[PDB]
């Protein structure tokens with residue numbers, strides 16, 4: 001592969017140069033003959049597979065702290081090696097675990113908010129053994145990160161995978177989501193995207209309120225055991241009711257959303273070690289709620305109803321009634337959140353900060369992998385600076401990875 | 414491998430087999446994806462390519478291996494052998510052009526692919542000849558507002574020294590002027606080209622919407638300036654249906670979108686000059702042309718006339734101005750009976766087209782980065798549609814700007 005790759009920004013003519021891609025550790029899905037950049041998703045490690053993976057991580061850790069080739073470095077290599085040989089695995093030091101987590105985020109090519117990658121509170125939950133313990137750890141995470149609306153980014157990391165039959169898993173794909181209920185007539189109540197999961201919860205014993213915005217319980221799996229249900233204390237779930245700075249009628253739509261975006265279904269990979277339960281959270285970009293959650297057809301789909309109250313001609317598409325309503329919904333979301341002093345970032349600010357971040361990363365690190373398809377906001381694309389920014393995508397490690405839904409893989413006891 | 418693509422909104426899955434046919438590169442590797450990078454012959458090189466195209470041609474008319482096929486293969490071989498090139502049959506020229514459109518992964522308008530009027534200009538020898546051919550193109554394709562897709566194909570490349578080139582990147586564009594006080598009049602993207610015309614004898618009206626002259630190079634010679642007759646250049650005054658003040662902004666645009674800087678490749682032959690034209694998707698003008706910072710950059714002005722609170726980004730004043738500006742463009746074109754499509758309709762049609770292609774062709778190369786409209790992304794169906802990108806020939810390729818390679 002070429003040593004230097006150049007990326008251009010077409011708005012500003014700025015050309016950046018990328019050397020970091022050479023450290024790419026895995027497959028993107030693309031080949032020389034086909035590109036899969038718009039494809040969403042394109043058993044344990046052996047002693048022999050694990051050795052080089054850990055050395056790679058450790059070397060990079062000691063390289064980061066400016067102690068490469070030092071005594072401490074070679075001792076750590078020797079200690080890890082002995083440990084893998086004797087136990088078929090190894091344990092990270094707390095310093096290494098934190099470094100690993102921050103760099104997983106730093107390496108997340110699909111994340112527009114990485115400017116903050118080094119401010120991340122890491123909670124080490126590797127001493128956890130039961131689902132009840134997972135519940136305590138998770139509640140503690142929610143409260144710390146919510147911080148009465150002044151959100152703080154954080155991750156809680158459960159014990160790594162051992163044999164594969166003892167994984168810890170949060171079954172919710174996000175810590176806080178709303179329930180979805182399929183009706184006999186085929187209409188859905190709540191968030192239609194979570195019908196399947198809601199049904200599992202009800203099967204497992206959940207008593208469903210059957211409202212529009214019901215916070216789902218946690219479904220938590222410890223040490224390969226069957227999952228257990230817990231209700232997050234309502235007082236820990238910060239919520240924001242959506243109103244509009246102009247249309248007094250907007251609050252009549254009865255809309256609200258949760259303040260904490262917290263992904264819980266991904267697998268954290270550090271130095272060959274797999275952390276299958278690693279809930280992490282930041283704060284929302286407005287479009288996530290105002291465009292995707294509210295206006296996707298297979299989601300809350302409020303476009304028509306908002307358009308009606310906006311009194312818009314809705315017979316033609318070329319009136320751009322959808323577009324017009326979309327803007328207002330997003331003005332509302334950003335407005336309601338700022339008013340309740342709950343941290344949120346609009347897509348203009350977020351994308352600008354990312355360009356600054358990206359430029360700094362080329363400077364100091366020699367690149368910054370980014371997935372354009374995800375970075376570019378789902379509205380007003382070309383009026384944000386990232387639309388014009390050429391990006392290179394590649395997978396560096398440590399990383400956050402997708403993994404199978406656990407209800408497909410679980411062996412019930 | 415058979416490859417699957419899912420739409421996430423409808424959960425529809427299509428199966429891609431067509432991709433097994435490509436030989437050209439995409440730019441990506443197993444380890445690096447360049448999906449957002451804009452720009453990622455002899456007797457021995459030329460024949461297999463020729464063979465492939467002719468083969469795929471006869472395969473498409475259901476006469477593969479025929480006597481017609483075999484002789485054509487023989488004919489083409491003897492010709493490359495003795496002349497270091499070959500000429501396409503007329504039937505082959507049309508097919509080749511239609512399929513280069515059909516394979517244009519960055520084009521959302523491909524549902525129209527086979528309704529293409531092809532003008533053979535391979536008999537052209539001079540820039541005057543070129544100007545005449547292009548004027549006929551503009552007049553036909555413009556058609557008094559009822560636009561018709563077209564392509565005009567000039568002589569192929571021979572030796573690289575005698576190249577046919579249209580120098581303007583598009584047939585119709587507005588001039589851009591560098592002001593004393595640092596600002597810029599007209600289209601800032603065109604300032605260099607605009608300057609090259611002035612440096613060639615173009616007397617510029619120095620307006621905000623001066624149609625540039627044509628700059629045509631024939632057979633490798635110096636290019637020559639020609640003014641398109643104004644009655645052939647249709648334009649549209651932009652007005653808004655509620656904001657009566659909108660017309661006072663003084664905005665117009667041309668009706669004919671016509672790319673002239675690309676290279677059409679067929680059977681290993683290279684047509685360096687092949688202006689092609691369709692009709693506009695509204696966002697092209699409303700979002701990109703009017704509101705890019707490096708372009709006409711009118712968001713601020715419009716937001717002013719709408720009296721929006723422009724202090725913080727989180728008011729989305731920019732987004733608000735954006736939607737209104739686009740409503741006007743669609744409204745104006747529709748009011749002047751000039752063909753235009755809005756991004757909602759174009760994307761629907763494109764998804765429909767994809768379905769067609771998978772069904773009858775086993776796939777459809779598509780560049781998600783380009784297909785997704787530059788505003789209101791995820792409320793158009795293409796946002797949620799996974800696309801596979803790969804390079805099929807015949808194809809439209811980029812080429813260097815002529816002012817960087819030309820020996821005057």
Ligand code: HEM
Pocket residue numbers: 101105108110111112113114116120153154155263280281282283284285288345350374400
């Ligand atoms: C601090 C403020 C943050 C902001 C503003 C932000 C912004 C975003 C946005 C808008 C997305 C796209 C989400 C979607 O479309 O579903 C995203 C994805 C992602 N973020 Fe960030 N994020 C933040 C914090 C974090 C943190 C703390 C982590 C991990 C430690 C993280 C890792 C990721 C990953 C791995 C994805 C891809 C998720 C997926 O593929 O489903 N982000 N981020």
Ligand code: HEM
Pocket residue numbers: 514517519520521522523525529562563564672689690691692693694697754759809
């Ligand atoms: C008939 C109606 C058509 C519509 C509505 C349409 C739509 C579009 C749009 C919106 C773009 C993006 C342009 C940009 O962002 O600069 C595009 C690009 C493109 N179109 Fe189409 N198009 C049409 C006809 C055609 C025709 C007739 C051809 C060829 C004969 C064609 C081939 C291409 C190619 C090669 C590109 C990419 C150009 C580049 O890479 O700069 N399209 N089309």
Ligand SMILES: Cc1cc(N)nc(CCc2cncc(C3CCN(C)CC3)c2)c1
Pocket residue numbers: 174176177261262263280281282283284285288292
């Ligand atoms: C760390 C982090 C930060 C941030 N701004 N957003 C996220 C995603 C949060 C999120 C919350 N609930 C639901 C989702 C869904 C939205 C719809 N997608 C299809 C799947 C993920 C995503 C994560």
Ligand SMILES: Cc1cc(N)nc(CCc2cncc(C3CCN(C)CC3)c2)c1
Pocket residue numbers: 522583585586670671672689690691692693694697701
């Ligand atoms: C065949 C065709 C159809 C269509 N609807 N649009 C196009 C693009 C036409 C077009 C016309 N003038 C100017 C441009 C520029 C706009 C700014 N871009 C950065 C480069 C291309 C593009 C081509």
Ligand SMILES: C[C@H](O)[C@H](O)[C@H]1CNc2nc(N)[nH]c(=O)c2N1
Pocket residue numbers: 037038039040373374375421796797798799800
């Ligand atoms: C098909 C396409 O890859 C898919 O719809 C992607 C597009 N870009 C996205 N971008 C973000 N931020 N989040 C998403 O879920 C998606 N979905």
Ligand SMILES: C[C@H](O)[C@H](O)[C@H]1CNc2nc(N)[nH]c(=O)c2N1
Pocket residue numbers: 010387388389390391449450451782783784
């Ligand atoms: C860097 C990026 O590839 C560049 O901004 C692209 C993005 N997508 C685009 N999409 C279209 N339709 N037209 C364009 O000119 C571009 N520019």
Ligand SMILES: [Zn+2]
Pocket residue numbers: 030031034035036037441445446447448
């Ligand atoms: Zn790729």
